[PDB]
Write an enzyme that holds these catalytic residues in place. Structure first.
Site, PDB file in Angstrom:
ATOM      1  N   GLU A  13      -2.700  11.403  -3.071  1.00  0.00           N
ATOM      2  CA  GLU A  13      -1.895  11.153  -1.884  1.00  0.00           C
ATOM      3  C   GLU A  13      -1.715  12.454  -1.130  1.00  0.00           C
ATOM      4  OE1 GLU A  13       1.223  10.107  -4.357  1.00  0.00           O
ATOM      5  OE2 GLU A  13       1.138   7.929  -4.035  1.00  0.00           O
ATOM      6  N   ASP A  48       3.709  -0.795 -10.088  1.00  0.00           N
ATOM      7  CA  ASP A  48       2.788  -0.693  -8.969  1.00  0.00           C
ATOM      8  C   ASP A  48       1.899  -1.931  -8.784  1.00  0.00           C
ATOM      9  OD1 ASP A  48       3.864   1.903  -8.630  1.00  0.00           O
ATOM     10  OD2 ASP A  48       2.399   2.701 -10.079  1.00  0.00           O
TER      11      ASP A  48
HETATM   12  C1  LIG Z   1      -1.622   1.663  -5.037  1.00  0.00           C
HETATM   13  C2  LIG Z   1      -0.781   2.371  -6.111  1.00  0.00           C
HETATM   14  O1  LIG Z   1      -0.899   2.074  -7.304  1.00  0.00           O
HETATM   15  N1  LIG Z   1       0.076   3.300  -5.644  1.00  0.00           N
HETATM   16  C3  LIG Z   1       0.999   4.050  -6.515  1.00  0.00           C
HETATM   17  C4  LIG Z   1       0.455   5.419  -6.828  1.00  0.00           C
HETATM   18  C5  LIG Z   1      -0.895   5.321  -7.533  1.00  0.00           C
HETATM   19  O2  LIG Z   1      -0.763   4.361  -8.598  1.00  0.00           O
HETATM   20  C6  LIG Z   1      -1.321   6.699  -8.082  1.00  0.00           C
HETATM   21  O3  LIG Z   1      -1.547   7.611  -7.004  1.00  0.00           O
HETATM   22  C7  LIG Z   1      -2.593   6.579  -8.945  1.00  0.00           C
HETATM   23  N2  LIG Z   1      -2.861   7.836  -9.673  1.00  0.00           N
HETATM   24  N3  LIG Z   1      -2.406   7.794 -10.876  1.00  0.00           N
HETATM   25  N4  LIG Z   1      -1.812   8.855 -11.216  1.00  0.00           N
HETATM   26  O4  LIG Z   1       1.370   6.080  -7.699  1.00  0.00           O
HETATM   27  C8  LIG Z   1       2.701   5.989  -7.388  1.00  0.00           C
HETATM   28  C9  LIG Z   1       3.540   6.870  -8.089  1.00  0.00           C
HETATM   29  O5  LIG Z   1       4.771   6.853  -7.887  1.00  0.00           O
HETATM   30  O6  LIG Z   1       3.061   7.701  -8.901  1.00  0.00           O
HETATM   31  C10 LIG Z   1       3.192   5.078  -6.448  1.00  0.00           C
HETATM   32  C11 LIG Z   1       2.284   4.270  -5.740  1.00  0.00           C
HETATM   33  O7  LIG Z   1       2.836   3.015  -5.366  1.00  0.00           O
END
Ligand SMILES: CC(=O)N[C@H]1[C@H]([C@H](O)[C@H](O)CNNN)OC(C(=O)O)=C[C@@H]1O
Ligand SMILES: CC(=O)N[C@H]1[C@H]([C@H](O)[C@H](O)CNNN)OC(C(=O)O)=C[C@@H]1O
Ligand SMILES: [Cl-]
Ligand SMILES: [Cl-]
EC number: 3.2.1.18
Lengths: 471, 470
Positions: free
Chosen positions: A326, A51
């Site tokens: 999300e 990420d």
């Molecule tokens: C900006 C970013 O980092 N987006 C991440 C998101 C985020 O890291 C979590 O929502 C944080 N919460 N941690 N659990 O997670 C995921 C995921 O597949 O799980 C994909 C996204 O690309």
């Protein structure tokens, strides 16, 4: 009833880059436009699947309802830091998009996160750095210079001003012209390119922006063929206390009924400075009432929410299970807005707003019929044979595997009755995005791997009501 | 050279109230007005000496340079919650004032903290409660109703509106008319008084404001005889992240030179939601460029400050020694602004602003010549025989005892040379406020106790240059 998968963005294999030099694709978004066009969006993750890193916001267009797809169109790709020690974390970052089209002006929006060079949200500092400064009614992004406490500003035409308001020889490319806008942030002294304000290590120019989480927007007025330069919408929506503010990726909506019809809604979520990722992840929406010109933050679902007898607020909370991250957003025929939020209860969490997404009702409904394994989901409103439904897709579990398309009937009080739970993809399954295609058909763009593919390959399938209502 | 003390606000003895039923006075502020009048302001702490309770903002006037003082004038005293379980913490609170006069309009300001019923800064909630809401371009104060999540608003004429925006039968007294404005916040249903929006416990009305820290302002256009109703300036200066926001009490200043001449400066300080009172106390100022009409917050001294190799910010810091709290503000002849900040280093901490208090230079100067035992101080600019000086008063230590008046020479480069450290009050000595009187004379109003007096009795002394250079 359910087509075979077509691969739209294909990742490499066995830890290797693909034929285009891309190791990974992630975070799908699918949009049906006013012209009938399908727009498929993704993170193009060049160096690896994590990420952060060198990541481009890209789309593909289909003009035949998903049968064939054109070439990749790159919306935004910031150039990497050529002098970084570790290329894996050596690039300014874009990550996570939401797509949506204004039904009246036809302008198509892509809204996505931005970080300067680093590990994205996983490298955010414990201390705040002011990112903007208001001066004579104007808001300017701040630059920091090595060894100086004061705030420089990027003003009109990208001209850099001193902390005491004097124009300098430095300027910022604030109107990028290169493909993918890879020159955005370039720092010049007159004729000479010195570096980039988004670079954080081994810098060759004296200036950098504040290390923070940012929100950017790009738009298309030609059915997604070409895109505007990135717009920094951060200061319109990000509160002073907010640490992280990013989109809940997938596809947003425009309210189609009630007193706020025409309002564009974009799912987002935040963390605070008390507990960050560990206890403050809080779903909400930002919205536009003027066709995307200006943006406003709605209130969080968690603001003044009652949990175990005590109230919390998204700016001050520290409560792991009360998090919501999300989300995907739906408007009902009665005007109510439903927000399906990724969470940690193991099952589906849903919030309800009655004022067009600005505030949320006191009770978060849980639906144990639909599993949530802590991963993105998507949901869409739909009509069928005179009745109102919601179609929602996500992993069935226990891991990010066994994709499901769940079906709910919308009851009179705005409550949901879950009718059907239809598997759509065995094996790995994660982020996904739904769209009504028309004529009783539906589209889904989703993450999956087979044959040693790196996470993930983004694939497309079509289905109809026989798939939704198999017994 | 140094007069004997005159007691201006007298506390009770041995834990008893005085003849007026007031146990305690605290937090002096002293102001010489354009007409030569001395205004002495204080916390009138009826029930006890603690930082909460029933506290009225009061002043006294002297027209003979401190020889005699008139009757007490009460600026603001909110009424207690008659049903509170414990009257000691059973009243909405005002506490800590700053006085200052605009030399052009002659308007006199009193700016002070406000909390709803509770223990004040030691009784703030753990979770943020939104205090304000903007609606159709207007900012309205929020009310919360028991059992309901949504935000009510107090709108025109104090009419209470629902979360979905319909007027109700309820109204707030938004134009108090009782003496001391003790009706402010009264909640009515039609003709019937039901309670007060500032009450937090055992309520008889359905509505309360957000439990938060507030900033209020009252003004006088008649040399301090009568005062306006309190104006709530909080939403002008209080950021979303700020937990506590209050004044650094004493006497503010008006810049007398430079491009921002005419700007009023009011010392304040904040805490954040990360460490609150434990590691986030951060000095700054608020200012007005329009004779008090609107207020703006300058940046904190601690914002982008370098501490132990890492930068911190007043909104995210958690560092005990890096704190700076109540402060006193002086402008030099060269235009620079100096901020002397209460702290935990054991000695005097000084910040410098070059833009009239908006931002602060990188290095906080420390002076071990001057003890700081973690207690309020005051400081004033003064000229003498062509040269520039700063007079600063505080406790000499080791406790809040042994009052001192320090004298520094302002050198050309803007540095300070401490010449004299003059004892002014043996025994207990705490908060104090200095003013130039004219003709080489100076006044000081300060906290002190003798003869079993409750903390504190506020006394006044005069001194001259033979005292500063004894
Ligand atoms: C900006 C970013 O980092 N987006 C991440 C998101 C985020 O890291 C979590 O929502 C944080 N919460 N941690 N659990 O997670 C995921 C995921 O597949 O799980 C994909 C996204 O690309
Ligand atoms: C609003 C308020 O409470 N004002 C208090 C102030 C404050 O409590 C601390 O500055 C914060 N905590 N100090 N660490 O302290 C004192 C004091 O004599 O020490 C007196 C003031 O009346
Ligand atoms: Cl650089
Ligand atoms: Cl009440």
């Amino acid at each position: 009833a359910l087509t075979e998968k077509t691969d739209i963005f294909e990742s490499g294999r066995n830890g290797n880059p693909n034929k285009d030099g891309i190791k990974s694709y992630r975070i799908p978004a699918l949009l049906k436009t006013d012209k009938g066009t399908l727009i498929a969006g993704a993170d193009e993750r060049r160096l690896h699947s994590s990420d952060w890193g060198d990541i481009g916001m890209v789309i593909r267009r289909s003009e035949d309802n998903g049968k064939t797809w054109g070439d990749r169109v790159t919306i935004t790709n910031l150039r990497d830091n050529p002098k970084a020690s570790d290329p894996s974390i050596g690039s300014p970052v874009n990550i996570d998009m939401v797509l949506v089209q204004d039904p009246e002006t036809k302008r198509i929006f892509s809204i996505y996160d931005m970080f300067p060079e680093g590990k994205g949200i996983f490298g955010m500092s414990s201390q705040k750095e002011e990112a903007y400064k208001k001066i004579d009614g104007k808001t300017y992004q701040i630059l920091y210079r090595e060894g100086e406490k004061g705030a420089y500003t990027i003003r009109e035409n990208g001209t850099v001003y001193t902390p005491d308001g004097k124009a300098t020889d430095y300027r910022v490319v604030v109107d990028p012209v290169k493909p993918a806008y890879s020159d955005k942030g370039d720092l010049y002294k007159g004729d000479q390119l010195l570096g980039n304000i988004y670079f954080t290590t081994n810098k060759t120019s004296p200036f950098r922006i504040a290390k923070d989480s940012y929100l950017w927007m790009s738009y298309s007025d030609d059915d997604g063929k070409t895109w505007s330069a990135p717009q920094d919408i951060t200061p319109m929506v990000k509160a002073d206390w907010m640490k992280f503010l990013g989109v809940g990726p997938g596809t947003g909506i425009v309210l189609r009924n009630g007193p706020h019809k025409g309002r564009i809604l974009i799912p987002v979520y935040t963390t605070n400075n008390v507990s960050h990722l560990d206890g403050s992840q809080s779903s909400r929406v930002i919205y536009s009432d003027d066709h995307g010109k200006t943006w406003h933050a709605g209130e969080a679902v968690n603001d003044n929410r009652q949990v175990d007898g005590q109230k919390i607020h998204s700016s001050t909370m520290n409560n792991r299970r009360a998090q919501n991250t999300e989300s995907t957003v739906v408007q009902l025929n009665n005007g109510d807005v439903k927000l399906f939020m990724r969470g940690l209860t193991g099952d589906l969490q849903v919030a309800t707003s009655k004022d067009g997404g600005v505030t949320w009702e006191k009770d978060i409904k849980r639906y144990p019929q639909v599993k949530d394994v802590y991963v993105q989901m998507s949901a869409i409103h739909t009509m069928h044979e005179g009745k109102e439904y919601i179609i929602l897709s996500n992993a069935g579990g226990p891991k990010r595997e066994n994709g499901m398309v769940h079906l709910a009937r919308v009851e009179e009080n705005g409550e949901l009755t879950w009718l059907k739970h239809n598997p759509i993809q065995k094996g790995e399954f994660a982020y996904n995005s739904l769209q009504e295609l028309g004529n009783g058909e539906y589209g889904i763009l989703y993450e999956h791997t087979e044959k040693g593919q790196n996470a993930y390959t983004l694939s497309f399938r079509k289905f109809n009501w026989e798939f939704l209502s198999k017994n």
